[PDB]
Structure formats: C-alpha cells, structure tokens
C-alpha cells in the first residue's frame with residue numbers, strides 16, 4: 001500500500017494472544033481488556049526500552065467495543081472498561097511517543113461477536129482518524145461472500161485514505177480466502193500495509209511449526225510480493241509467555257526476522273523474564289527484521305530434520321537460519337557449504353560470518369569453497385549474518 | 391515381582407532420551423555412549439545431591455554392546471567405548487553408593503540393531519549378575535510373535551532369579567502388546583518390577599500430553615495393578631533438556647509423582663539449569679512419588695481444557711494436580727469443591743492444603759463444604775497436598 005507507511009515491518013504490541021477477550025474486570029481487573037491495561041503497557045513500552053528497540057505501535061485487538069453503536073451509528077468503546085474513551089487513550093499513547101492501533105471487522109460482527117463495520121466503512125474510518133488512531137487491524141469474520149470480503153477490504157482502504165490521516169492498514173484478507181481461493185497478492189498489496197496469511201498463533205511450539213511449514217510450503221506464492229509498504233504477517237510474537245522453551249523462543253525470533261514479518265509482541269510487559277526481554281530487544285536480530293532492502297527470506301532447503309532459511313539484506317549481506325526439528329537427543333551438528341548460501345554470491349570470493357543466536361559470536365572469514373559447521377539444539381535455531389568481502 | 395525390590399518407584403538416570411545411540415567418539419567424545427559418560431554422571435549423581443534426593447540407579451540403555459558375542463556366547467561391552475568393561479564400571483558405580491542398570495532385548499536384536507538375548511537368556515542373566523548389574527531394562531524389539539515375547543520376558547525373569555543377585559527387572563512387554571493384545575498385568579507384575587506401557591517419550595510437550603492422555607484414557611485398566619514391587623512406567627523425565635517450557639516441566643514432574651512412576655531422568659547432569667535441578671530434587675514432590683503406600687493416582691475430572699488428577703497417600707493425605715490444557719491466553723481460574731477431592735474423605739471434616747508446585751505455599755484449612763480456587767498457567771500444573779484433620 002503506497003501510503004508511505006510500513007517501509008519496514010511494523011513493530012508493536014498487540015493484546016490478543018496473551019489477554020484475549022477477557023471482559024471480567026470484577027474478578028480480574030489487572031488482566032481484563034480495559035483502558036488501564038493499555039495505559040500500563042504504554043508506560044512500560046517507554047520505561048523498559050521497548051520503544052527504543054523499535055516497538056512503537058500499541059494495538060488494541062478485539063473486544064474493546066460496546067455491544068451496540070451509538071445513536072449516530074458510531075462504534076463505541078465499552079463504557080465500563082474504557083470509560084474515558086479511545087480519544088483520551090490515543091492522546092495518552094501519543095504523549096509517550098507511541099502510536100495507537102485498533103481493531104475492526106469487514107463483516108457484520110467481529111470474530112468475538114461485537115459490531116462489524118459492514119455498512120459503516122466511511123463512518124468507522126472517520127471515527128478512527130478523528131480519534132487519532134494510527135493503525136487498523138481489519139478482520140474478516142462474519143462476511144457472507146469472498147466478493148463482499150474483498151470489496152469491503154478495498155472500500156475500507158480507500159475510506160482510511162480519504163481521512164487524510166496516516167493509518168497503517170493490516171488486512172486479514174488472504175487468511176479468509178486461502179481455504180476457498182488463491183489470493184491475488186498484487187491486489188492485496190495495492191490496498192494493505194500487511195496481511196495475515198494463516199491461522200491464529202497460540203502459545204505453543206506446534207503452532208509455530210505449522211506457521212513455518214505453511215509459509216515454506218507456500219513460499220513461491222508469497223515471498224516475492226513482500227517489500228517496503230506491504231508485508232506478509234505470520235502473526236504475533238508469543239515470546240515471554242508460557243508454552244515455549246527457550247530454544248523455541250529463539251526459533252520464533254530468528255525466523256520472524258528472516259521472514260520480514262511485522263513484530264507484534266503479545267505478552268505481559270509487566271511480567272516478562274529478563275531473558276525473554278533480551279531476545280525481543282536484540283538489536284542485531286531486529287536489524288535483520290528491519291533491513292531497509294525489505295526482501296523477505298525463504299527456506300533454502302530441508303532434510304534430515306534440519307531446515308536452512310536465508311534472507312538477502314542490503315549491502316550484499318545475508319541472514320541465515322538453521323533450525324533443528326528433531327525433538328529428541330541433544331545438540332545436533334549441521335554442516336553446510338557456504339557456496340550454497342546466497343545463490344552462490346554471499347561468500348564469493350569470501351564472507352565474514354557472525355552468529356547472532358542463540359549467542360552472539362564472531363566466526364571469522366569463510367572462502368567460497370569453505371564449509372560451516374554448527375551445533376543446533378532440538379527445536380532451536382542458529383542465526384548467522386554473512387558479510388561479503390568485496 | 392516378589393523380589394523385595396522397587397518397594398517404591400525406582401529412581402535414577404537413563405541415558406537414552408538425551409544421548410541416544412551416539413557411537414561417534416571421534417567427533418563427539420563428550421556425548422558418545424562410553425564408559426566415560428557414565429563415570430562422569432555417577433560422580434555428579436553424588437556431588438550434585440541427586441543420590442541424596444533418591445536417584446540411585448545409573449542406567450545404561452541401548453548401544454553399549456559390541457556388534458558380536460564372544461566365543462563363549464556372551465554379550466561384550468564395545469571394546470573402544472567401554473575398554474575397561476562393564477565389571478569395572480559396575481565396581482566404580484558401586485564405590486559411589488550407586489547401582490548400575492543395563493539394557494538388553496528379548497528378541498534377536500536390540501532396537502538400535504545390536505545383539506539381542508533370544509537364545510541366550512540364561513547366559514545373559516548369568517553375565518549381568520557376574521558383572522554386578524543391579525537393574526535390567528529388557529526391551530521387546532525384533533520379536534517375531536507376542537507368544538515368544540511373553541515367554542522371553544518370563545524366561546529372563548526366572549533366569550535373573552536363579553542368579554541369586556537382586557536385580558530390578560524393567561519390562562517393555564506390555565508396550566509391544568498394545569494395541570494388538572490386552573496385557574494381563576497380574577501376569578506381568580508376577581515377573582516384572584515395572585513395565586513400559588506406551589510409546590517412547592521425546593523432548594516435547596506433545597509427547598508429554600500424549601503419555602498423559604494415553605494413561606488417563608487407559609487408567610481403569612492399569613492404575614489398580616500398580617503398587618510396591620510393580621509399577622507402570624510412562625517413560626523418562628525429560629526435564630532440564632530443550633523442548634519444554636518451565637510450566638511443561640512442572641507438569642511432567644507433578645504428574646509423574648501422581649502416577650507413581652519410576653523417575654528415570656534423561657538429561658545432561660554436567661549441564662543442567664539450577665531451576666531444573668531444584669524441580670527434579672524437590673523433596674516434597676519426590677515424597678509424593680515415593681509414598682510407601684504405592685497407590686497410583688488417576689484422572690478425577692476433565693472439562694473446559696482443565697484436568698484434575700489425584701493420588702491417595704499414606705497418613706490419610708492426598709496429592710491433587712490441576713492441569714491447564716488451554717495453550718492460549720494467560721493464567722486461568724479454576725474452582726473445585728473440596729468434597730469432590732479424595733473420594734469425599736480427604737477434607738471431611740476438614741483438610742489443610744499446601745501448594746507444592748509451581749511454588750510451595752500453605753493455603754490453610756478447608757472445611758468439607760468449602761471450595762478451592764486456583765490460577766493455573768497455560769500448559770502448567772498446580773500440585774497440592776491435602777492433609778486431613780483427624781490425625
């Protein structure tokens with residue numbers, strides 16, 4: 001989408017995976033979906049270095065709305081949970097140097113069953129712009145046909161444009177299409193800054209494997225379409241929650257960098273481990289994700305329960321991820337000829353290799369004919385950066 | 391098996407899950423299956439408090455053997471990886487106050503393809519006894535029929551008995567019957583100290599869930615036969631490795647205590663986190679597992695992605711485990727009437743409830759009519775010990 005936004009993948013925080021649709025502020029006031037939750041997250045995004053690392057979008061997912069529209073046909077923030085309204089939340093967020101994201105749905109209801117934007121695209125778009133919203137995640141539930149789905153996504157894109165406000169537009173468009181038809185990513189890119197392709201992530205290694213496997217299986221359809229202003233979205237970072245081993249967390253961070261994915265944390269910034277914080281704020285890995293060239297990486301090869309992925313970077317640099325998918329035993333050795341990397345030009349005539357994950361370490365120079373040996377933990381990943389010597 | 395052994399579930403270390411069948415001592419001398427690996431683990435079992443916690447059997451799994459039997463028809467330790475032989479290793483382990491376990495197979499080959507014991511049961515039993523072996527894990531691979539399988543397990547039991555040496559006998563018998571024939575656990579218990587029922591564990595939450603779900607699905611068949619000298623084996627503890635989150639590790643430790651499972655660690659004692667070490671050495675949780683009464687726990691209820699398991703303990707006490715199987719969101723509230731716990735007698739007239747996992751904390755007295763409220767992390771478990779107020 002040619003709105004000057006998302007020239008690198010969008011970085012932020014999104015409540016959904018960790019906090020979901022919790023409406024019970026009686027019993028669980030510190031975890032229910034309320035203005036206080038987002039105000040606290042915004043405070044910690046500044047104070048705990050998240051904004052400095054590059055995470056600038058604080059995003060409300062589903063279950064922020066009142067059950068009904070007001071008498072002027074506008075979406076309302078829940079009166080009990082957002083008593084001061086979204087404008088005041090937006091102003092608070094902007095005062096921290098952050099940006100506010102919000103959620104709506106192309107169909108008649110949100111996926112959680114709250115008011116949809118069908119019949120109200122212009123009104124909702126203007127409401128959001130008038131509130132000071134900076135990002136819109138636009139979901140695809142309760143839409144009665146794929147033609148209405150596509151039309152609505154295009155209408156909302158133009159409606160947001162007409163407001164004149166800079167609003168990052170996130171479309172779940174192709175995710176609801178894939179089961180029935182192959183999406184037209186050329187069309188989707190014209191209207192969207194990024195797009196969810198596949199099923200919702202959850203707090204598990206299984207979920208992460210399915211997203212990677214779906215992405216690598218379908219990489220010829222989706223990789224080349226991605227670029228500055230338009231990204232594939234494999235869903236939220238779930239690092240720092242409950243269901244992932246340390247190695248599986250390193251794997252998600254590494255592969256989301258390789259995939260040029262938007263980096264939307266979904267965790268509790270109030271209660272997050274030092275190690276999870278360090279991984280998510282890793283400047284060298286974020287630098288790969290944020291690389292200005294914006295070429296999405298891909299799976300180079302798979303076999304013997306290993307995978308090798310790579311991503312071309314600006315300045316003739318390459319990022320290389322090697323994943324160990326064998327979930328038994330100990331660290332397993334993997335040897336690759338560097339000549340196989342970067343279409344043969346990464347290390348022609350030579351390259352300097354630095355390991356970034358699981359620990360940062362310089363590995364020295366490598367001639368075009370040389371081989372790289374690494375030991376990779378089960379479900380873990382080794383992430384390398386290659387610098388050409390020319 | 392009525393041999394005076396395994397009166398509580400056997401506790402120890404078993405190399406298989408973490409080290410497997412690594413024969414490459416050229417490239418990986420510190421992780422290949424060798425006498426050096428086991429000597430290092432035995433040293434650490436003493437020096438890092440494992441033996442004090444109860445872990446006493448240092449067990450060799452598959453891939454210790456040379457490819458051929460000797461001229462007298464005996465199994466041999468691999469000469470390059472165990473150049474000093476099994477006897478000296480057994481002696482070394484015995485000098486630490488530890489016990490040595492070893493692996494063999496009822497069929498023609500071990501699962502990794504090395505010499506099996508079919509046609510050599512007496513010879514192998516005699517060989518192990520002579521070496522000073524204290525435990526035999528006896529596998530069921532490469533057996534042409536279930537009749538031969540059962541006969542071989544019975545023969546080796548009797549062969550071990552005739553040596554006169556006390557040897558804990560671990561039988562994979564029923565795991566190779568399932569789901570083809572219905573195991574008879576009264577028969578199996580007569581010949582074995584414990585028995586693998588289900589597929590090999592690996593370093594994954596999927597595996598742990600698979601083992602728990604299999605067990606709860608089959609609990610009516612297997613729970614009652616368990617007891618002193620005869621245990622169900624749901625396979626190794628894989629805590630301290632690579633594939634489990636903290637909460638999933640807590641879940642394994644809690645449920646293996648509930649299940650009265652043998653506690654065979656498979657990990658690298660040279661490289662294990664203080665957190666993992668503390669969990670595996672948790673005195674209160676080990677005390678539940680090792681309860682003298684030896685009554686295996688069971689799944690009391692499941693619904694809404696929650697599971698409640700309970701185990702009757704000695705001294706009118708009960709262990710209760712609550713698992714959150716929803717793998718999305720945050721800690722989830724769960725409430726249960728304490729009158730539902732321990733078949734209604736645990737908290738009649740009252741009980742004192744102490745949380746043991748994920749952290750230890752006294753919860754206080756609960757009357758028979760009261761309700762217990764807990765918050766449980768995704769893929770995590772809350773483990774409680776109930777103490778009745780009669781004594």
Ligand SMILES: *[C@@H]1O[C@H](CO)[C@@H](O[C@@H]2O[C@H](CO)[C@@H](O[C@@H]3O[C@H](CO)[C@@H](O)[C@H](O[C@H]4O[C@H](CO)[C@@H](O)[C@H](O)[C@@H]4O)[C@@H]3O)[C@H](O)[C@H]2NC(C)=O)[C@H](O[C@@H]2O[C@@H](C)[C@@H](O)[C@@H](O)[C@@H]2O)[C@H]1NC(C)=O
Pocket residue numbers: 574575576577
């Ligand atoms: C799973 O395996 C176990 C152990 O083998 C079985 O339990 C055994 O069942 C047999 C019956 O087949 C019992 O034998 C009997 O023992 C009593 C002693 O109390 C004898 O009086 C009795 O003798 C009669 O029958 C014999 C037939 O050959 C003759 O020699 C005699 O002349 C006389 O007529 C017979 O020997 C075992 O005592 C019993 N062992 C144990 C440890 O309990 C399981 O059998 C089932 O469960 C048992 C508890 C019992 O209820 C059986 O009736 C059940 O069939 C077996 N389970 C299955 C599903 O087959």
Ligand SMILES: *[C@@H]1O[C@H](CO)[C@@H](O[C@@H]2O[C@H](CO)[C@@H](O[C@@H]3O[C@H](CO)[C@@H](O)[C@H](O[C@H]4O[C@H](CO)[C@@H](O)[C@H](O)[C@@H]4O)[C@@H]3O)[C@H](O)[C@H]2NC(C)=O)[C@H](O)[C@H]1NC(C)=O
Pocket residue numbers: 002003004005007160161162163164165166167
């Ligand atoms: C609503 O939609 C319209 C129609 O697409 C959209 O107008 C477009 O805006 C973009 C971004 O501002 C314009 O592209 C720019 O063109 C100027 C002049 O040629 C260039 O200076 C810009 O290049 C710089 O910035 C780029 C990043 O955007 C960098 O890639 C580059 O290196 C430079 O630093 C940039 O190419 C585009 O010209 C118009 N298109 C049309 C048809 O007018 C408008 O922005 C949308 N409005 C809202 C509210 O979203």
Ligand SMILES: *[C@@H]1O[C@H](CO)[C@@H](O[C@@H]2O[C@H](CO)[C@@H](O[C@@H]3O[C@H](CO)[C@@H](O)[C@H](O[C@H]4O[C@H](CO)[C@@H](O)[C@H](O)[C@@H]4O)[C@@H]3O)[C@H](O)[C@H]2NC(C)=O)[C@H](O)[C@H]1NC(C)=O
Pocket residue numbers: 392393394550551552553554555556557
């Ligand atoms: C080979 O097989 C034979 C036949 O099974 C086996 O003989 C059995 O050995 C066990 C264990 O030593 C004997 O069990 C003991 O029996 C006596 C009474 O006769 C009891 O005093 C013993 O009590 C101990 O264990 C109790 C557990 O309930 C404790 O409460 C108590 O504190 C004691 O520690 C114990 O029950 C059993 O009598 C014999 N059986 C027969 C028929 O002879 C032998 O051990 C096997 N040999 C090897 C080397 O495996």
Ligand SMILES: *[C@@H]1O[C@H](CO)[C@@H](O[C@@H]2O[C@H](CO)[C@@H](O[C@@H]3O[C@H](CO)[C@@H](O)[C@H](O)[C@@H]3O)[C@H](O)[C@H]2NC(C)=O)[C@H](O)[C@H]1NC(C)=O
Pocket residue numbers: 106107108118142143144145148149
């Ligand atoms: C949101 O819900 C509204 C209301 O139900 C949907 O509008 C309705 O859509 C149906 C079918 O999509 C329309 O039916 C059509 O009627 C014409 C005759 O006029 C007929 O030729 C067609 O074959 C079809 O049966 C219906 O007219 C329309 N009703 C209203 C009140 O507008 C809307 O499509 C839903 N939006 C999404 C995105 O799902």
Ligand SMILES: CC(=O)N[C@@H]1[C@@H](O)[C@@H](O)[C@@H](CO)O[C@@H]1O
Pocket residue numbers: 016061062110111112139140172175196198199200
């Ligand atoms: C693909 C997609 O957008 N999925 C979304 C998920 O991300 C979340 O927003 C949820 C809210 O109810 O609705 C969906 O299923």
Ligand SMILES: CC(=O)N[C@@H]1[C@@H](O)[C@@H](O)[C@@H](CO)O[C@@H]1O
Pocket residue numbers: 406451452500501502528529530562565586588589590
């Ligand atoms: C059920 C059973 O005994 N499983 C065993 C496993 O625990 C290990 O010993 C392996 C060695 O090759 O062989 C088997 O599959």
Ligand SMILES: *[C@@H]1O[C@H](CO)[C@@H](O)[C@H](O)[C@H]1NC(C)=O
Pocket residue numbers: 184186187
């Ligand atoms: C995809 O969409 C673009 C823009 O609408 C169009 O030019 C192109 O033909 C479409 N591709 C196909 C084959 O559907």
Ligand SMILES: *[C@@H]1O[C@H](CO)[C@@H](O)[C@H](O)[C@H]1NC(C)=O
Pocket residue numbers: 496497498508532533534535538539542
């Ligand atoms: C082992 O092999 C022999 C010869 O092939 C066969 O007759 C015998 O039944 C086998 N034993 C088992 C336990 O499978």
